[PDB]
């Protein structure tokens, strides 16, 4: 089987914990990461990759007003290559698109998705390629002001997705299976960025509803 746990953070494969600010660039963040696990899979290099230039050139998505993952991937496939952050810098509003091939540090052969609410499908994705970028319910005040533990909320609604994030692993702590969730409300939110949200507690907050990751 897949290991019964993962934590893409210690085979150097996650960059660090961005702050998104509030603009409705999630769904970019959550693509970059997704990217950057891949691409140091690749060619053996962490680096960031640029979110704005998905906030300002994905045509499909709608900018700071949000977006989805999928489109993005389809974006960096399409349009040959995404470029780097320091090529092209996060300023958290929308601009127009100024993608420049010369500072391309990645490139996206298409992309798959995870079938609809299937956790041990979503563990094995995360096992076999690295991080995956997924979307959750986050509206919960007990999400928002998560400090440590495994997060788990009966309110919490599995068909009201409204934020993404990336899943760069999995495990167990105090007997409670988990996954390991890279937020981009900085370092200062949660722990040092991160929280553990349960895993295999019936889909919690529609974690494995909307889970995909690029192909390089
Ligand atoms: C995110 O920053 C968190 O709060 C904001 C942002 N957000 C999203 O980006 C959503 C992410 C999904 C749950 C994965 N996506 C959307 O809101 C969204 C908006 C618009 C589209 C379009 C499809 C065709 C044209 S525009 C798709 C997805 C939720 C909230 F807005």
């Not at 499909?60 to 092209?88: H, L, P, W």
Request: aromatic share 10%; hydrophobic share 30%.
């Amino acid at each position: 089987r897949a290991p019964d746990s993962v934590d893409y953070r210690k085979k150097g494969y996650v960059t660090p914990v961005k702050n998104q600010g509030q603009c409705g660039s999630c769904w970019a963040f959550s693509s970059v990461g997704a990217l950057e696990g891949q691409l140091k899979k690749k060619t053996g290099k962490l680096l960031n990759l640029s979110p704005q230039n998905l906030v300002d050139c994905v045509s499909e998505n709608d900018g700071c007003g949000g977006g989805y993952m999928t489109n993005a991937f389809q974006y960096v496939q399409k349009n040959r290559g995404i470029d780097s952050e320091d090529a092209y810098p996060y300023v958290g509003q929308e601009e127009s698109c100024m993608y420049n091939p010369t500072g391309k540090a990645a490139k996206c052969r298409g992309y798959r998705e995870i079938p609809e609410g299937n956790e041990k499908a979503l563990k094995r994705a995360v096992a076999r390629v690295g991080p995956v970028s997924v979307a959750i319910d986050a509206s919960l005040t007990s999400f928002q002001f998560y400090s440590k533990g495994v997060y788990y909320d009966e309110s919490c609604n599995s068909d009201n997705l409204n934020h993404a994030v990336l899943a760069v692993g999995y495990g167990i702590q105090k007997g409670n299976k988990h996954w390991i969730i890279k937020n981009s409300w900085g370092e200062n939110w949660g722990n040092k960025g991160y929280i553990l949200m349960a895993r295999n507690k019936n889909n919690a907050c529609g974690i494995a509803n909307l889970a995909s990751f690029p192909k390089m």
